[PDB]
Each structure stands twice: as structure tokens, then as C-alpha cells.
Design a protein around this nucleic acid. Structure first.
Ligand code: ZN
Lengths: 619, 381
DNA sequence: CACACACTCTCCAATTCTCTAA
DNA sequence: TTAGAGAATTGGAGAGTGTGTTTTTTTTTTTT
């Protein structure tokens, strides 16, 4: 009987606790009006989730003693609260159906302890701690009901798990043969379980100390909700269990291993027609192209055409070998704005990636095969170019990638695939990634006596695959320096209003790009076709002088990509002469910056081969 | 280490700590432990294997660990130069370098670390200067860029095979976390070390693997770098990156670049020789016609100084703009100046505002930053 | 080795067989 | 005719016995 039940050696009455929690559910209307948690139990009826999250601050404000009993004795109290919630969910809404009994999930919003100060006095208390997940194990199947069958006579029985053990039948009731009941593993019933290793956050550490870690266990319906690298305030019971000295011996070490029996996660670092009509109205705004290009990278100064090219890359061409991915190269001295621009723009798009061209990159450009450490089996770890299969890949310090990386990147940029024949695996992974690059000069400074390919020492076989190449060196003008200094002073005086304006611009920019990807598919108009043919023929007519080649058809395909991207920027859905002229302008400016021989200006052969005519005529 | 016999590895003892004796100790700490020396009585298979022998542990019972007049002395307006003089009286000259080192210990407004680098030939008193900063600073480390058989600049994972439980430990950058890390022969670093320092300069944390899995490990230390020429004595006809043989992506990170060049000078050589001979003859520095300030008092001073939080006004921002553009004219006419230069002079001016112990910068701060950068370039030239 | 599987061996007692009274 | 007390046969609980238990040097190919 409920009224006779009392927590063991505790004098807390279970029925009183249940009724007090029901009173909390009934009366708590005031988080700052129906009760908040009865509103949530109205929502759960249609949402269908099997849990009710509740705030321990709310419980404490309603009743100090109930909160204290929850914190002190969660192992008994939380099942009591579950029974209370499942009674209320059929007192109200009595005709409802739900596949599982509701699980209450108490939590304090902030940490009650930090993991360095956990003590044995905290054992079996409800606590919550802040941390970062280091590793997350495979889904462990944990038994909850053992199904036994008689080997002789096929009689079956079911027995509950007591405290992890099984009360094996020892004799079959329907034929009385001893030791004849056999556990049928796949007829038994299992719940989900997973181990999570949690490290304290870096700011919480003492000065120069290595991290402490704690083990978490998350069970059914709360199992796979966290990933490595994320941050969480995790609420659970601080358990202490014995560990056996040897797997074949039941002696246990005197020192108990501890872990967190997880009850609630709260991720702390992860974060419509109105949106559609706002974006549609914004697409008709005058100079929307310049508006979006200026919204790109507010911290960076004056680089208009670079931002415009990055915008056209982020919008991309029309998908349908018909590669629509626009390739962009940034080129300039170390310490300049290109690295900051890459580190900004990679998080501005879904499916994006950022990596270094050097061997210290966390995720390499090439796919490889490794032994997964937690299980020591082979796993095909694909590279960043493959993980960014429909997004931008930001390759910083592009220039100094080794020859194998150069070859596989050439393969990716030309074929939009990455072939691997490593360890018996033979497969051709898709990589429709938009390569955005940042390349330094080989020496410490840019050399105006030399063109881009000779300064950066990259092959023409890679440089000719890029749609646009831009120079990020700064002028030596005192007006430029003074304007840059005023801009940097404004960045120093950046305040909350500028931050909110920049974040509003960032949000609408992300939404605009995603919507344009989702719905816009530009297609050629007749004037677009005539303009593109005219552009290619005109830029080929320059070759009448000196008998040189001044263009090649991949330039035309690049212009098609850029025009389609510009049409997608303004949500036209049909590409026409306005887009084609902007594509021509930006493309010609990129060639003017990149393909300029110092002796004669722009010359197209610099991209086709290294060593332009003014250099090669030494021999 | 200084108590081990001559030809022997240092011995170790397991200490088991219970109750309120726990959490008294930390790694790297010097302690004296009163306890009971006892044998570990293992069970089962280990008993027949070990026989009458037994491992031992120490059952710990006790663990023990081994101003307004002064503020008026600090109030004397000499205090800036008084401190600069107190910094390493064993080294003559380079007084502006000593001022820069003081601002390194102070730090700017919170970024904030004044990373600096001072190149020179071997034996130029460069190592002696770095050793002084390591001794003075409250949290610090001193290491070689090369190749050490110890734990590297990054932390490392030890095994402790009697238990077999792998654990992270050390790392010069990690041990120096809140303070300053001094690196000798920075030029001779491996590429892994160069990338680690690059990561520290970028985001002030490093990545390391324990058992194939990996974590992030925190280190916000200021870097004090000493480097050699690639060959011989420094020649000013060659640029610093080509001479020192370091990439500009790292070498531009340091706020100040100094060249501690050494050349003969008769009277200064004789003064130096008299100093060294007195040090050998009496095991102490000779009297210097002044009293260095107590290092504990210097630590108190820089602590309350670092607790001040300056901010720049708009007029001083305009002054920063004018000084920066003029300095960039000079650099362009003679190129290792960029937006990082403006941020460097802002950092140094806020550092001097902290040194003045006032929550707003002033013209003398920007003047000091400008002249320190200019004369560091002059020392390099 | 001291703590677990696997097998043999011993005597206790649990249930039925048989004789007797109600 | 039906049910309880004394004697006989066999199940198995328990005691005893036997057995089982990272880190350094040297090479080779390929990466620069
Ligand atoms: Zn059976």
C-alpha cells in the first residue's frame, strides 16, 4: 500500500511525496494562466514524446522540502514523480494513449558542482555538472526481461532482471527436467544504453591543470542525444559501483568506480511564410547584390569584388559532366585578411568545412583508412573534400600542400569525385564541393616582379581549374591606411547594437542563401546565350594581336557558372544579360588581378602555362 | 633531483591518501609526508608469483607543503625605471628591452598577451635574460625549441605500467598556462612544435591524444622566444626571416622583435668581466650602487597592476590612427607592418596604462608603444 | 596460490507400500 | 469400507576431491 511505503532508513513517505509532486503540478502557474507543466502535459498528448522536463528551481521555489528530497533521494523519488505524472496524465485527458509511461526529467539550469569537487558524500545524490563530451560509445543493448525456453518440451517463460542478475528457472514447470531451460537471447527484451566520457570545460579548469573526466551512462530514449566535441550541462545520479579484480573472480576492488546515471541533457553551445515573404521582398531591393556582398564579412575592409565572388560561390550555379561548383582562390601575404575571411565564411553555410593544407590539419583532404581506437576495426575516414560534398571547403595555407594532396585535389576539382583503393576497399566517393582557397607567396612578401603562379609555386593544372583568382594585398596608399585604421578603430569600438545588427544580417544572409538553394533553378534565356557567345568570341578576338591565345572554352563555362549564380542571387530563375554582364565584369577583374604579367599587363597564357612570354623569351 | 646519488635514477614511492589529507597535493609540488611505510598485500595469483617479496606504499597521515609603505615606494614616479633597473642588474644596457619585458609581464587589455622575440648569437647573454624572466615570473617555463627527450611544448601521455593506466602530463605551454613560456633556440623547433605554437597564437589551446581518442588542452601563455642566426653572427645586410630561417606566419605574431647583437667594446667588456669574476669569487652579484626591488614586492605590484582594466578614449584612438599611418609611411619607405601593428601598439599602450595603474590610457602610453616598436626595429636595423 | 567448474561419494529424509483400527 | 501408523526404497543436499587461472632498434620502400 502506498501510505505504508517509506524510503529506506529515510523517513520520507512515498505517498506524501507523490501527492506533493501532484500539488506542484497542479499549482505551479508562475515560472516568472494554466500550470506550466500541465500545459506541457497537454502538449505531450499531440507531440508524443515519452518525457516531461521539469526545472529543479521551480520545484525549490514551490517547496524547499520537496526539492531537498528530490536531490537527496532521486533513486526512489524520481520513480515516485514518474508515477505521479502518469497518474495526472490519466486524471487529465483520461482517454489518451501513449506507447510508454512518462519519464520525468528534473534538472537545475546551472551546475550545482564541478567535477573536481565531487566527493563520496555526493554518492546517490542528484547532481548536475558542466562538461564537454570526449567520446561516445556504441549503442549497448542492455537486457530488461530474460526469455527462457525448455530444450526438451518447448515450454517458455519470462523473468525480470532483479539488479542486473537473472533468476534462472533451474527446472521446467511443464516437464520437470532440471537444467533444461535455456536463455533465448533474441527473444529476450533489451533497452538502449550508451557510455559517454565527459571532460570539464576549459574555462572551469584550474591554472595549467590537465582535465578531469567522468563517465556517463544514458539509457533508453535519452541514448544518442550528444556527440563528441559538444558542450552540455548534464543532470544525473552520482553512482558508485564495485569493479571486479579479474573477469573470472567475484572479488571486487575496495576503491569504487563512479559514473553519472544521466537523467537530463541540456546543450549549452549549439545555438516560415514570414521568412519567405521577407526574403522575396528583399530580393526586389535595389542593389541587393551589393547589399549581400557587403553583408559578407563585416570585419573585413574594402574587398568588394572578393566578397562578390564569395557570394556567387555560396549561391553556386545550376546543378546540371556539368559541374556547377564555383572555385575561388584568394592570394596574398601571410597575416592578411584572407585567413580571417575563410574562418568566417566556412560556418556561414550548411555542409561547410575548414581545413589546413599542411599536415597538422585535423581533417585531411585525402580519404584514408584507420583502426577505430575504441573497437580496433577498420573505418574509412573520408577527407574534408568528401565531407563537404554539397558545401564549401575552405582550404587555408593552400600553397604548401604536398604533391599527393595536390594530385587528389586536382582529381576532386576536375572530376568531382575522390577514388580510393587503400586496403581492399575500392570505391569512388562523390565530392561536389566548392573549393575556396587561400594561398601565400613562397617568400614572406608578394613580389610584383613575378606573376601569381611563379610566386605561389602551384601548378597550372590546379590554377586553371579555379573560376576566379583574387589578390588580397593592400595598397601602400596613406589614404588606404588611414581608412583601414579608422575601420579598425570602429571594430574596436564595436558594441551591442552593432553586434545585433551584424547578427541580424548574418541570419537573413544564411536564410536567403538556403532558400535560394532550395527553390531557385536558373535557366538560359536567348539574350543570355547570345551574350555568352559574344563574350567568348570577343575575349578570343584579343588573340588577333601577337598571334596569341587570349581565352579558352573553360572560361566560357566559368562565365556560365557565374551568370547562373548571379541570377540565383536575385531569385530571377532565368539568367539574362544583367547577370551575364556582371559575370563578365567580375571574371575580367579577376583575370586582371591574377593573370597580369608585370611587363605587358593581363595575358591569358599565364593561367594556361607557367612562364609567360616575357619570361620564356629568355631562351 | 639534487639529492639523488651521482649515477642513479631518482627513486619513487606510492603514497595512499585518505580523508582530509586528499587534495592537499598537486603534480609538480614539493611536499613532506608523514606516514606509515607498509607493504601492499596483494591477493591470489600475484601472491605465489611474488613470494616473500612485496611492493610498498606510504600511508599518509600528514602532508605539509614546502603593505602601504611599499605602495608608497611604488608611488614614487621613478617606479617604472626603478622596476626596469630591478630587472636583471646582471645585464647592462637594453633598458628599453627591459621595459618591454615588464610590459610582457603586465599584459594588455583582454588577445592581451604581449608575445615578444629577441634574436642573437649564442652566448650573447640572451639565455641569461630569459632565465631571469623565468625566475621572476609567478607561473612560467623555460625550454629549448629543439627536440627535447622530456615532455615537449605540448603535453604527453605516460603509461605507468605497474597499473598500465595512461595519463596526460606536463607540456611546457600547459604548465605555463596563465603566465609566460620561455623558448630557447626557437629557430630549431620541429614543424610539430611550430604548428603547436601557431595554434597557441591563434586560439590558445592545443590538441593531444591519450589512447587514440583526443581532447583539447588549454594554454594561454605568453611566448618569450630566443632564436639564433642560421649560421654564425648576425649580418644586418640580410633580412630577419631569411637570416633566422623562420616562417613569417609565426615570426610576425610577436609584438616586438629585438636583435641582441654582440660586438667588442673595451670598457663594457672589462665591466662584464669584473662582474663575472666577482660572481665566481663570491657566488653573488657585486654591489650595483642601487638596491633591486624585492621580487615578491614586484610580484605584488604587477598583480595589482594586472587587476586594473584600462579603456581607450576616442581622442587617443585618433592619435593612434595618426601615429599608425605615419609609422606605416616609415615602414613602407624602408614590410612587417599591418593591422597587427595597430593592435600591437594598442596592446602596449593598454599595458603601460596598467603599469600606471589607471583605468584609461593617455598620450604617454601611445608614445611609449610607438617608440618601443620603432627602436626595436632600429635594434634590428 | 586461493577462488571457481566439474565429478564422485556419503547419509539424511521425503514419499510410497503394507498392516491395522475406526 | 476408509483412513492413520510403522517399515522400505530412492532423490538429492552437502562434503570432499581434482583441476584450472606503449618503446626501441633495424629494415625497407617511398615520399619529399
Ligand atoms: Zn520442459
Amino acid at each position: 500500500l502506498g501510505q505504508k511505503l517509506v524510503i529506506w532508513g529515510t523517513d520520507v513517505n512515498v505517498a506524501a511525496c507523490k501527492e506533493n509532486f501532484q500539488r506542484f503540478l497542479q499549482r505551479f502557474i508562475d515560472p516568472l494562466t494554466e500550470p506550466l507543466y500541465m500545459q506541457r502535459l497537454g502538449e505531450i498528448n499531440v507531440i508524443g514524446e515519452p518525457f516531461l522536463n521539469v526545472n529543479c528551481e521551480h520545484i525549490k521555489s514551490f517547496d524547499k522540502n520537496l526539492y531537498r528530497q528530490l536531490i537527496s533521494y532521486p533513486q526512489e523519488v524520481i520513480p515516485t514523480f514518474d508515477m505521479a505524472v502518469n497518474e495526472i496524465f490519466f486524471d487529465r485527458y483520461p482517454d489518451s494513449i501513449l506507447e510508454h509511461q512518462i519519464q520525468v526529467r528534473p534538472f537545475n539550469a546551472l551546475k550545482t558542482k564541478n567535477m573536481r569537487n565531487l566527493n563520496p558524500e555526493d554518492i546517490d545524490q542528484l547532481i548536475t555538472i558542466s562538461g564537454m563530451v570526449i567520446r561516445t560509445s556504441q549503442l549497448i543493448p542492455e537486457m530488461q526481461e530474460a526469455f527462457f525456453q525448455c530444450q526438451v518440451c518447448a515450454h517458455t517463460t519470462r523473468v525480470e532482471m532483479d539488479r542486473g542478475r537473472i533468476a534462472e528457472p533451474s527446472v521446467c514447470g511443464r516437464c520437470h527436467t532440471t537444467h533444461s531451460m535455456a536463455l533465448i537471447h533474441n527473444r529476450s527484451l533489451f533497452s538502449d544504453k550508451q557510455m559517454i566520457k565527459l571532460q570539464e570545460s576549459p574555462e572551469d579548469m584550474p591554472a595549467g591543470q590537465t582535465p578531469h573526466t567522468v563517465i556517463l551512462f544514458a539509457h533508453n530514449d535519452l541514448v544518442d542525444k550528444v556527440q563528441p566535441g559538444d558542450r552540455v550541462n548534464v543532470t544525473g545520479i552520482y553512482r558508485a559501483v564495485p569493479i571486479r579484480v579479474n573477469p573470472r573472480v567475484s572479488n571486487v576492488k575496495s576503491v569504487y568506480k563512479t559514473h553519472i546515471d544521466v537523467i537530463h541533457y541540456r546543450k549549452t553551445d549549439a545555438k516560415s511564410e514570414k521568412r519567405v515573404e521577407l526574403l522575396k521582398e528583399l530580393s526586389r531591393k535595389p542593389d541587393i547584390y551589393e547589399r549581400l556582398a557587403s553583408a559578407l564579412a563585416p570585419s573585413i575592409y574594402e574587398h568588394e569584388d572578393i566578397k562578390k565572388g564569395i557570394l556567387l560561390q555560396l549561391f553556386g550555379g545550376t546543378r546540371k559532366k556539368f559541374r556547377a561548383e564555383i572555385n575561388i582562390l584568394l592570394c596574398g601575404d601571410p597575416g592578411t585578411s584572407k585567413s580571417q575571411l575563410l574562418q568566417y565564411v566556412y560556418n556561414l553555410v550548411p555542409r561547410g568545412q575548414y581545413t589546413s593544407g599542411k599536415g597538422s590539419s585535423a581533417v585531411g583532404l585525402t580519404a584514408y583508412v584507420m583502426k577505430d581506437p575504441e573497437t580496433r576495426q577498420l573505418v574509412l575516414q573520408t577527407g574534408a573534400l568528401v565531407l563537404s560534398d554539397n558545401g564549401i571547403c575552405c582550404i587555408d595555407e593552400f600553397d604548401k600542400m604536398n604533391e599527393s594532396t595536390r594530385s587528389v585535389l586536382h582529381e576532386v576539382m576536375e572530376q568531382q569525385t575522390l577514388s580510393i583503393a587503400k586496403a581492399g576497399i575500392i570505391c569512388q566517393l562523390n565530392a561536389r564541393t566548392s573549393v575556396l582557397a587561400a594561398a601565400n607567396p613562397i617568400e614572406s612578401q608578394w613580389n610584383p616582379k613575378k606573376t601569381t603562379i611563379e610566386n605561389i609555386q602551384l601548378p597550372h593544372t590546379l590554377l586553371s581549374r579555379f573560376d576566379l583568382i583574387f589578390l588580397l594585398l593592400d595598397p601602400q596608399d596613406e589614404a588606404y591606411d588611414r581608412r583601414l585604421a579608422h575601420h579598425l578603430v570602429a571594430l574596436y569600438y564595436q558594441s551591442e547594437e552593432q553586434a545585433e545588427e551584424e547578427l541580424l544580417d548574418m541570419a537573413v544572409l544564411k536564410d536567403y542563401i538556403a532558400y535560394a538553394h532550395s527553390t531557385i533553378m536558373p535557366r538560359l534565356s536567348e539574350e543570355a546565350s547570345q551574350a555568352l557567345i559574344e563574350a567568348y568570341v570577343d575575349m578570343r578576338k584579343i588573340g588577333s594581336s601577337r598571334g596569341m591565345v587570349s581565352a579558352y572554352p573553360r572560361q566560357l563555362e566559368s562565365l556560365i557558372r557565374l551568370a547562373e549564380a548571379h541570377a540565383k542571387v536575385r531569385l530571377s530563375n532565368k539568367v539574362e544579360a544583367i547577370d551575364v554582364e556582371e559575370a563578365k565584369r567580375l571574371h575580367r577583374e579577376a583575370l586582371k588581378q591574377s593573370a597580369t604579367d608585370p611587363r605587358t599587363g593581363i595575358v591569358d597564357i599565364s593561367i594556361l602555362t607557367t612562364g609567360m612570354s616575357a619570361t620564356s623569351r629568355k631562351r | 633531483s639534487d639529492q639523488v646519488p651521482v649515477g642513479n635514477i631518482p627513486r619513487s614511492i606510492t603514497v595512499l591518501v585518505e580523508g582530509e589529507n586528499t587534495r592537499i597535493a598537486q603534480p609538480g609540488d614539493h611536499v613532506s609526508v608523514t606516514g606509515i611505510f607498509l607493504p601492499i598485500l596483494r591477493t591470489g595469483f600475484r601472491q605465489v608469483v611474488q613470494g616473500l617479496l612485496s611492493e610498498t606504499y606510504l600511508e599518509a597521515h600528514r602532508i605539509v607543503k614546502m603593505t602601504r609603505e611599499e605602495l608608497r615606494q611604488i608611488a614614487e614616479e621613478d617606479f617604472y625605471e626603478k622596476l626596469a633597473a630591478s630587472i636583471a642588474p646582471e645585464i647592462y644596457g637594453h633598458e628599453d628591452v627591459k621595459k618591454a619585458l615588464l610590459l610582457l609581464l603586465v599584459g594588455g587589455v583582454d588577445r592581451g598577451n604581449i608575445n615578444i622575440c629577441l634574436m642573437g648569437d649564442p652566448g650573447v647573454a640572451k639565455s641569461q635574460l630569459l632565465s631571469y624572466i623565468d625566475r621572476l615570473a609567478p607561473r612560467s617555463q623555460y625550454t629549448t625549441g629543439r627536440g627535447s627527450s622530456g615532455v615537449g611544448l605540448t603535453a604527453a601521455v605516460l603509461r605507468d605500467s605497474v597499473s598500465g593506466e595512461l595519463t596526460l602530463e606536463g607540456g611546457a605551454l600547459v604548465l605555463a598556462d596563465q603566465g609566460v613560456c620561455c623558448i630557447d633556440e626557437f629557430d630549431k623547433m620541429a614543424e610539430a612544435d611550430r604548428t603547436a605554437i601557431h595554434e597557441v597564437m591563434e586560439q590558445q589551446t592545443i590538441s593531444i591524444a591519450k589512447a587514440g581518442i583526443l581532447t583539447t588542452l588549454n594554454a594561454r601563455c605568453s611566448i618569450l622566444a630566443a632564436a639564433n642566426p642560421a649560421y654564425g653572427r648576425y649580418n644586418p645586410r640580410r633580412s630577419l626571416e631569411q637570416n633566422i630561417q623562420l616562417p613569417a606566419a609565426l615570426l610576425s605574431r610577436f609584438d616586438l622583435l629585438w636583435l641582441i647583437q654582440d660586438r667588442p667594446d673595451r670598457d663594457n667588456d672589462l665591466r662584464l668581466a669584473q662582474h663575472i669574476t666577482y660572481v665566481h669569487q663570491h657566488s653573488r652579484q657585486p654591489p650595483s650602487q642601487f638596491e633591486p626591488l624585492d621580487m615578491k614586492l614586484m610580484r605584488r605590484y604587477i598583480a595589482m597592476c594586472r587587476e586594473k582594466q584600462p579603456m581607450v578614449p576616442e581622442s587617443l584612438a585618433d592619435y593612434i590612427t595618426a601615429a599608425y599611418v605615419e609609422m606605416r609611411r616609415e615602414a613602407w619607405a624602408s614590410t612587417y607592418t599591418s593591422a597587427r601593428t595597430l593592435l600591437a601598439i594598442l596592446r602596449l599602450s593598454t599595458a603601460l596604462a596598467r603599469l600606471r595603474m589607471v583605468d584609461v590610457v593617455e598620450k604617454e602610453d601611445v608614445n611609449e608603444a610607438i617608440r618601443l616598436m620603432e627602436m626595436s626595429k632600429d635594434s634590428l636595423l
